[PDB]
Amino acid sequence: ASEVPQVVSLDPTSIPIEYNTPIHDIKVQVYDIKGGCNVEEGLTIFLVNNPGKENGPVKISSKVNDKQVSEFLKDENMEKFNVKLGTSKHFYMFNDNKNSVAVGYVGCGSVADLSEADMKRVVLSLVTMLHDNKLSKLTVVFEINVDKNLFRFFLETLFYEYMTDERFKSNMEYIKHLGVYINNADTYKEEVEKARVYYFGTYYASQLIAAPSNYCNPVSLSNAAVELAQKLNLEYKILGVKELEELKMGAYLSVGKGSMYPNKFIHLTYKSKGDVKKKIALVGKGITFDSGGYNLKAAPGSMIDLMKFDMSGCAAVLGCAYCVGTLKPENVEIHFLSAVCENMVSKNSYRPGDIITASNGKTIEVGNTDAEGRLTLADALVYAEKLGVDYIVDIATLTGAMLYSLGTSYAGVFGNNEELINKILQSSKTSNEPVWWLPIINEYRATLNSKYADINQISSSVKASSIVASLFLKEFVQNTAWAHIDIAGVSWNFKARKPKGFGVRLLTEFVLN
Amino acid sequence: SEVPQVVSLDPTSIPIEYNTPIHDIKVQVYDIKGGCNVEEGLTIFLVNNPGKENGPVKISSKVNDKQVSEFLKDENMEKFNVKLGTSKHFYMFNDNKNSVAVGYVGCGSVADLSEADMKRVVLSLVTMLHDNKLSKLTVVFEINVDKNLFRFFLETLFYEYMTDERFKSTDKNVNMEYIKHLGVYINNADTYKEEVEKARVYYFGTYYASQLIAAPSNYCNPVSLSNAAVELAQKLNLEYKILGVKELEELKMGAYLSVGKGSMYPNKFIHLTYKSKGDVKKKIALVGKGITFDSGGYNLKAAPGSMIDLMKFDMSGCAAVLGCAYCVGTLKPENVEIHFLSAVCENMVSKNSYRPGDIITASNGKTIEVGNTDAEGRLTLADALVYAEKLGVDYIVDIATLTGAMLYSLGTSYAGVFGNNEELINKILQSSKTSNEPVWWLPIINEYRATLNSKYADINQISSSVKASSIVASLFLKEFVQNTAWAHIDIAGVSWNFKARKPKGFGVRLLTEFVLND
Amino acid sequence: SEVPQVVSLDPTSIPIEYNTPIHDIKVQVYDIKGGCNVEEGLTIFLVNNPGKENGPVKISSKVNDKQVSEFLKDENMEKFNVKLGTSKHFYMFNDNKNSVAVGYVGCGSVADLSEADMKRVVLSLVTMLHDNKLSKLTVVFEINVDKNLFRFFLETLFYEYMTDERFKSTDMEYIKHLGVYINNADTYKEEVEKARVYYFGTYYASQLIAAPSNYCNPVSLSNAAVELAQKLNLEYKILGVKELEELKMGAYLSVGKGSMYPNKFIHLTYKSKGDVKKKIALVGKGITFDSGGYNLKAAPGSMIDLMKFDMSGCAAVLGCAYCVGTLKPENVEIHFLSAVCENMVSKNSYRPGDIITASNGKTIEVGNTDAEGRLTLADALVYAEKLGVDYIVDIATLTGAMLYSLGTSYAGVFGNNEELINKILQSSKTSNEPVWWLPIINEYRATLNSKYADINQISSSVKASSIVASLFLKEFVQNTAWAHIDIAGVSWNFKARKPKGFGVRLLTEFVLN
Ligand SMILES: CC(C)(C)C(=O)N[C@@H](C(=O)NO)c1ccc(-c2cc(F)c(F)c(F)c2)cc1
Ligand SMILES: CC(C)(C)C(=O)N[C@@H](C(=O)NO)c1ccc(-c2cc(F)c(F)c(F)c2)cc1
Ligand SMILES: CC(C)(C)C(=O)N[C@@H](C(=O)NO)c1ccc(-c2cc(F)c(F)c(F)c2)cc1
Ligand SMILES: [Zn+2]
Ligand SMILES: [Zn+2]
Ligand SMILES: [Zn+2]
Numbered sequence A: 001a002s003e004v005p006q007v008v009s010l011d012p013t014s015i016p017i018e019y020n021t022p023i024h025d026i027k028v029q030v031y032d033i034k035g036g037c038n039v040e041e042g043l044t045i046f047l048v049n050n051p052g053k054e055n056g057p058v059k060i061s062s063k064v065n066d067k068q069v070s071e072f073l074k075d076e077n078m079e080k081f082n083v084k085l086g087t088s089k090h091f092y093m094f095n096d097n098k099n100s101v102a103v104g105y106v107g108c109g110s111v112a113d114l115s116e117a118d119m120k121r122v123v124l125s126l127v128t129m130l131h132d133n134k135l136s137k138l139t140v141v142f143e144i145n146v147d148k149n150l151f152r153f154f155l156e157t158l159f160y161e162y163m164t165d166e167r168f169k170s171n172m173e174y175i176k177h178l179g180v181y182i183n184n185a186d187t188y189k190e191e192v193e194k195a196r197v198y199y200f201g202t203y204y205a206s207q208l209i210a211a212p213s214n215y216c217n218p219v220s221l222s223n224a225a226v227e228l229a230q231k232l233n234l235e236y237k238i239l240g241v242k243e244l245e246e247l248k249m250g251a252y253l254s255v256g257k258g259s260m261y262p263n264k265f266i267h268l269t270y271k272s273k274g275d276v277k278k279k280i281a282l283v284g285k286g287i288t289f290d291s292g293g294y295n296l297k298a299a300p301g302s303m304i305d306l307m308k309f310d311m312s313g314c315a316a317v318l319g320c321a322y323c324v325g326t327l328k329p330e331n332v333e334i335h336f337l338s339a340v341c342e343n344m345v346s347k348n349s350y351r352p353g354d355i356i357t358a359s360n361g362k363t364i365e366v367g368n369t370d371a372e373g374r375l376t377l378a379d380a381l382v383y384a385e386k387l388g389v390d391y392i393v394d395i396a397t398l399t400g401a402m403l404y405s406l407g408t409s410y411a412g413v414f415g416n417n418e419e420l421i422n423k424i425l426q427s428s429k430t431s432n433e434p435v436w437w438l439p440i441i442n443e444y445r446a447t448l449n450s451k452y453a454d455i456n457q458i459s460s461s462v463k464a465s466s467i468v469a470s471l472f473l474k475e476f477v478q479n480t481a482w483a484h485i486d487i488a489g490v491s492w493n494f495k496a497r498k499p500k501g502f503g504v505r506l507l508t509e510f511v512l513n
Numbered sequence B: 001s002e003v004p005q006v007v008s009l010d011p012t013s014i015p016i017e018y019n020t021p022i023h024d025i026k027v028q029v030y031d032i033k034g035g036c037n038v039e040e041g042l043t044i045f046l047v048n049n050p051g052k053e054n055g056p057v058k059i060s061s062k063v064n065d066k067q068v069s070e071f072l073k074d075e076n077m078e079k080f081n082v083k084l085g086t087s088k089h090f091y092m093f094n095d096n097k098n099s100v101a102v103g104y105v106g107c108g109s110v111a112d113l114s115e116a117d118m119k120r121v122v123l124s125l126v127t128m129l130h131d132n133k134l135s136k137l138t139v140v141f142e143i144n145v146d147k148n149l150f151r152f153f154l155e156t157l158f159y160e161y162m163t164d165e166r167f168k169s170t171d172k173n174v175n176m177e178y179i180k181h182l183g184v185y186i187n188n189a190d191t192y193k194e195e196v197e198k199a200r201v202y203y204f205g206t207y208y209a210s211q212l213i214a215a216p217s218n219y220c221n222p223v224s225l226s227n228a229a230v231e232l233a234q235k236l237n238l239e240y241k242i243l244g245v246k247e248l249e250e251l252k253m254g255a256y257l258s259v260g261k262g263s264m265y266p267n268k269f270i271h272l273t274y275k276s277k278g279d280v281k282k283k284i285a286l287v288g289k290g291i292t293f294d295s296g297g298y299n300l301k302a303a304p305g306s307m308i309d310l311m312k313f314d315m316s317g318c319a320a321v322l323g324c325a326y327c328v329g330t331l332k333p334e335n336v337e338i339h340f341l342s343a344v345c346e347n348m349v350s351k352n353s354y355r356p357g358d359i360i361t362a363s364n365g366k367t368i369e370v371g372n373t374d375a376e377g378r379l380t381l382a383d384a385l386v387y388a389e390k391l392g393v394d395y396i397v398d399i400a401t402l403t404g405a406m407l408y409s410l411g412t413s414y415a416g417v418f419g420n421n422e423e424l425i426n427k428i429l430q431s432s433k434t435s436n437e438p439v440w441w442l443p444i445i446n447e448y449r450a451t452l453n454s455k456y457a458d459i460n461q462i463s464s465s466v467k468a469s470s471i472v473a474s475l476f477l478k479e480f481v482q483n484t485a486w487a488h489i490d491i492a493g494v495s496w497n498f499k500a501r502k503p504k505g506f507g508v509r510l511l512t513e514f515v516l517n518d
Numbered sequence C: 001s002e003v004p005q006v007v008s009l010d011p012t013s014i015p016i017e018y019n020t021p022i023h024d025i026k027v028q029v030y031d032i033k034g035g036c037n038v039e040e041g042l043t044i045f046l047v048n049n050p051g052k053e054n055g056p057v058k059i060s061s062k063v064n065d066k067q068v069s070e071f072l073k074d075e076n077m078e079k080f081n082v083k084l085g086t087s088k089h090f091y092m093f094n095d096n097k098n099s100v101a102v103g104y105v106g107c108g109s110v111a112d113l114s115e116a117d118m119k120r121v122v123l124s125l126v127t128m129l130h131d132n133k134l135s136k137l138t139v140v141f142e143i144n145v146d147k148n149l150f151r152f153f154l155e156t157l158f159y160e161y162m163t164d165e166r167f168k169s170t171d172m173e174y175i176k177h178l179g180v181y182i183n184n185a186d187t188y189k190e191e192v193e194k195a196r197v198y199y200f201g202t203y204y205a206s207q208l209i210a211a212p213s214n215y216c217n218p219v220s221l222s223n224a225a226v227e228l229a230q231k232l233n234l235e236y237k238i239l240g241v242k243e244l245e246e247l248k249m250g251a252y253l254s255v256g257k258g259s260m261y262p263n264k265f266i267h268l269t270y271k272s273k274g275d276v277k278k279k280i281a282l283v284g285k286g287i288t289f290d291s292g293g294y295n296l297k298a299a300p301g302s303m304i305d306l307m308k309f310d311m312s313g314c315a316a317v318l319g320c321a322y323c324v325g326t327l328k329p330e331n332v333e334i335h336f337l338s339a340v341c342e343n344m345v346s347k348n349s350y351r352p353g354d355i356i357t358a359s360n361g362k363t364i365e366v367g368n369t370d371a372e373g374r375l376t377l378a379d380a381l382v383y384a385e386k387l388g389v390d391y392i393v394d395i396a397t398l399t400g401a402m403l404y405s406l407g408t409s410y411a412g413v414f415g416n417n418e419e420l421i422n423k424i425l426q427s428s429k430t431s432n433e434p435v436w437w438l439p440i441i442n443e444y445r446a447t448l449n450s451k452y453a454d455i456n457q458i459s460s461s462v463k464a465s466s467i468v469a470s471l472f473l474k475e476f477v478q479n480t481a482w483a484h485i486d487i488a489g490v491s492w493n494f495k496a497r498k499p500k501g502f503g504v505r506l507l508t509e510f511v512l513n
């Protein structure tokens, strides 16, 4: 660990992290729905739809072993409510044994197959009830059709949205039990503890992102990665400035010049006990705060107050490290990499127009100091290819233009290898973290031709900045299958005012399958 | 039919050139194994060097002239290299003691030239045709191209060679002269021969669309554009129908009509039809956005970078569809019925204009809340799409300069395609490949549909405020196709060639290939 | 003179090319009478057609090669036209069966070419040189140029031909001979080696300007100026912060407060060997990077990435120092001055509103930290006048408004003395570096009346910024002929993405004549 510098003694010197969450204490049981439902304790919620009849009435089919609840659930009562996606109702009542129970439903629409976005709305409705609930148990009865991956997604999302981050603070009570009624329960049981792992990986990423830039800086973040590595028995190595200078990472070092925090390059490694048959490098953009540099984020809508999230790529990679270190896949070697620094305004900062030299010898003309992500990634990519891996995948809050292309739901993936892109797309499908394949259009490459340097950092005209940024990155991968995931648009949940932890499950599914 | 005028100097028709100098070029194709005759004009060798970047020039073709062959020997040609786009001129006397001009264009070190690579080659060749009064060009192929690429070479050569001087008066090019003969030497020539006149057909459809787009909004208005479409239909003996305002009112096209309310030109709905003789296997509706000028309306294009002076381009989709109509009407495909549609109007600022906040009713009965008058294109398309589905077709493909956000997603080279049907989308991509007009599949993300939920109307026209506009606009259009395979091509970013300051006529070849191979 | 570094990869000197391939070109000038020989390389005829716009090409010169004469016959050349900048060139065998290239550049239909026309002609010529491997270029003048325009042709040819590759790393063959056919060749021969000197003075200035702000800083620029002085046997003196504090240069020192590089005042001196009959101070604005300071260049179109060019005035002066030091004019004493610093954002920077005191005791109210040029020039001008000189001429990238007045071609000249101004205009005509006289309007002076300080730095309303800035500078020259050349609009060739080196030949012609 390294000592993080302070301006005043009241400046924090570590990131507060919660490992043991109330979610981990929840005992989960899955029952088959064919046998009927037991309603004796806590809150019971039926997931109900009505195919064909848009906003049609609620109808409960499951038999329950309680006379009081059976009467409440009768068709004449339930038809007073409708299945409009996200709509919920729940009532408190006494059961046959005169114990207080709560019974309700969440509408799941009129389409039999729920998208991940549909399922998310269902969960949010459920969580709203939970945040006003003090009962010890929740039972969810699936009277809809979900596959194994979507059911795991249901649990992951439920766990993630339920949990509230109160680290920076100075009603309800977390349930101790979760019951689930679903068809062929036995096949869904193995998803439960996988969901719990995917949850924390995602929530851990969220904690790092949500942590403000005075708490989460290059030194405190690399410190956290070390502590994580030690807990998971991963090989770890933090490269300091002197080492970085020796490796000649001029692009990455240039970005951090104006920061009071020294650059820290995070390198964690998972190695399988058995034969190593595939080597992967995961690269996360790790800007702990993006002020923009001398190209300061002062334009309307530039949202400088959001830019603690510019290390979301790093967070996703570290979150994946947790999942991989916990699930311990076989026959694989994975490197978790992040060139961490802070982009600030100072007498010491790099300037627009500056020509800097990357670790592969390429000279780069800086057109915009706020395009700093690709500079750090450039040296990180050179570092990764030197490891001699089969796949290189980077993930980064790289370009604001993603907001105008795919939006806030789908991340974009670019690459030099169709097979690798396909694996990512497949991983997106099974993780239910949506990604869309975007092209690297070679005709735009000429725009990066610098008059004085080997290459330009940005275009002056093209405006297709996400593609141009990909073209720049491609110049630092010489002979390895490489993919690039731009999560600038999808990383932050603007409506809920919190991170998503996007990427963790996607990257984990990628290495596992 | 009568174009309204403000003053007598206002034009009442779009000047259109049908018989171009390109059509006067006699094209001959010879097989390269017979040897090349170098007699006159300019003879250009298309040469590459596989694996050797900036490799030396070597003329592998048999040249049927002792003097020219001597000139083109490897020893003499070594000094020149094949760097993609590079070119050289040679001057010499042939065996008949006549002075002849010879040269080459470098095609690089790749074995397969891409879309952009070949256009680079053609542009280099065109520079050799400009500022040189030549009567004949001979092109010798020493690179390998498939039939579609050979056709693409000719189409692009014709299109770039052609110079549009319709609006020139005192500044016509005094030295403008076109070759009268084109010679082509290539391996297995008989295979490529049929591609020649197809290329000339593809050239004009593209150039015709280009003429309509380039034509300024005072020349090209809803009345004169619909008048041009009738003249085209009459020339091709296609069925044609133009729907006037009273007919449009009967069909209750409130979305389309509201957009044109502020204009001095009455709305004109174009409906051309190609009908194959015999069994019709496929019925297709092609829909083009036909905004002759987009001021933005009361949401005026006044913001920095909004490029209001470009907005004559906003009927590029309609132009593409009409260009396709020329190609289809000329090549006469079998087993198909094609409907060429465009809801044409002008988006202007007036006492009569539609307002931000207005609730209008589309022809399928859905009420629409206008949040931005500058999103007028999807409004006209909405009624056009409803009209299209009433025709009972198998495929509906619309093409439109719809969202500026395409510049930020795919840029100026690739068009975006959206749709409700994977098979149709795949056919569009296939047509993209064979036409060499690049298109990329983009998603219609259903999670964003909620943002189009209106407090008062059935649906919001736009925004508040997803930012992924191209997708939101596609979601809106989807609401007006109920049960028909539909695809949407946003060409807002690729329609105009900013570098050359001219239209591309994008989509004509794409749509034609779609029709011809479906 | 030790350049401070943030990281070990930060450059500590400006790379400079002194020996260029241009200097290895052997120039021969022949009279057009007696005919032209075409034996090898590329031969280009400069042709116009006064009778017809875009008229046919017609070669008038007798060529002593029959094969080439056949090529140049009227029937062949009339297929080509003389539109300015249009060119064609063909490869062929001459009488000796040696490969030669012969062509032309269109020179339009106006008998007398302007400097803008001639530059277009040269650019067409250079395109051919860059695209052909040639040991020799021959140019045949079938147009009319005077001695100054001919030199300009050579200077421009040399400058545009030369390619700056100092910052190229890892992402050939110049001509060795130049032949010129022209009527009355003997009167043009003496322009050749003068042109070569003017070329490098201009190219040397270009090298300094093009060099990014991380390479070119106040310390390395002053170091570079010393190296130049040593090679030319000029007296030199670099004033450091202690000395500047002693000289009370508060305006100059305030600007550099926020930089990591100490202020460095450059003072080079050329003195003729004989009696000194004229003393001249040339003053160049030397801002190595202009971020704008706390008035950050953040507005759209402010082009902060261009701002390495803000020492262009200094570079022109140093480039002039090369030419003067090489050509060694008689009975003159020339001082080359530049108050070099960097305008940055820091805890240490000067603020908007700060009241500072120039070396002549005048207190100045800073209204805008991005108007820093006039503040550095203020102390530089006071320094210059104390040298007891006859003329003071400053050259500076001072005001962006120049783009709106004269544009990108003509610099503006302001002054307090009509004789000096007319001399500069005369030097503009002979150097072919276009300048236009603009007024110092005394009615605007009242806008600089500060409420608290002696004077305002900027006007709060009078949008005539170039004139207002001239009024400010005028306050720091008390009793000396002074002129001010604003090159903010002309210094950078935006189309070619490179500096012009504007001002070197202008200032040198001023000293020489
Ligand atoms: C426009 C340039 C090329 C400067 C760019 O993409 N900059 C990105 C950047 O700063 N990289 O280090 C960038 C990244 C994200 C965002 C962004 C801004 C918002 F207001 C958002 F809500 C968001 F999700 C992303 C904007 C610019
Ligand atoms: C921002 C909204 C959603 C209103 C939009 O996309 N409007 C488009 C429109 O006016 N439809 O009728 C629109 C279409 C094209 C462009 C556009 C602007 C430019 F400066 C270009 F260079 C260009 F190619 C397209 C901008 C907005
Ligand atoms: C508007 C003020 C008075 C602050 C001003 O002229 N500032 C100049 C300055 O920064 N002095 O230190 C200034 C100088 C040059 C430019 C300038 C900007 C561009 F984008 C150009 F392309 C250019 F040629 C000059 C703009 C402002
Ligand atoms: Zn940034
Ligand atoms: Zn960033
Ligand atoms: Zn519009």
Ligand SMILES: [Zn+2]
Pocket: B291, B294, B314, B374, B376, B377, B401, B402
């Ligand atoms: Zn429009």
Ligand SMILES: [Zn+2]
Pocket: C290, C292, C369, C370, C371, C372, C373
């Ligand atoms: Zn400034």
Ligand SMILES: [Zn+2]
Pocket: C287, C290, C310, C370, C372, C373, C397, C398
């Ligand atoms: Zn300045």
